[PDB]
């Protein structure tokens, strides 16, 4: 039965102003557009953390950081996940960092 956790992609978000935010589909490794069909680029770190939590509600995301590598992404969409174009844009995505909760006195 021996495992391969690496078959799951890392949770991350990517932004390009003028288009809906993208995020990594953990299960299939593809970049998908915004689940609500409405969210566009975010200009605060706190907003990006909130967005990670919205897209990955069960992952215990507690922090975010820019990824090491720039990434090319196709299929950016407008509101409603409409007028999706194959035109590529490269951006630096943000990794959604899973937190390990511990107890305090």
Instruction: Could you list the residues known to form a binding site for heparin, using ranges.
Output: 75-89
Q: DSSP for 5-19, please give it.
A: GGGSPPPEEE--TTS
Binding-site residues from annotation = 75-89
Please name the residue that has the structure tokens 């557009």.
33
- Kindly tell me the burial class for residue 64, based on how many C-beta atoms sit within 10 Å of its own C-beta (0-12, 13-18, 19 or more): buried
Listed in sequence order, the residues at least 6 apart from 89 whose beta carbon sits closer than 8 Å to its beta carbon are 16, 19, 72, 73, 76
């Amino acid at each position: 039965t021996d495992g391969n956790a690496g078959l799951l992609a890392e949770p991350q978000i990517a932004m390009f102003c003028g288009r809906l935010n993208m995020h990594m589909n953990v299960q299939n490794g593809k970049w998908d557009s915004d689940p609500s069909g409405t969210k566009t680029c975010i200009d605060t770190k706190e907003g990006i953390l909130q967005y990670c939590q919205e897209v990955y509600p069960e992952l215990q995301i507690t922090n975010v950081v820019e990824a090491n590598q720039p990434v090319t992404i196709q299929n950016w969409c407008k509101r409603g996940r409409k007028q999706c174009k194959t035109h590529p844009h490269f951006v630096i995505p943000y990794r959604c960092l899973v937190g390990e909760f511990v107890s305090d006195a």
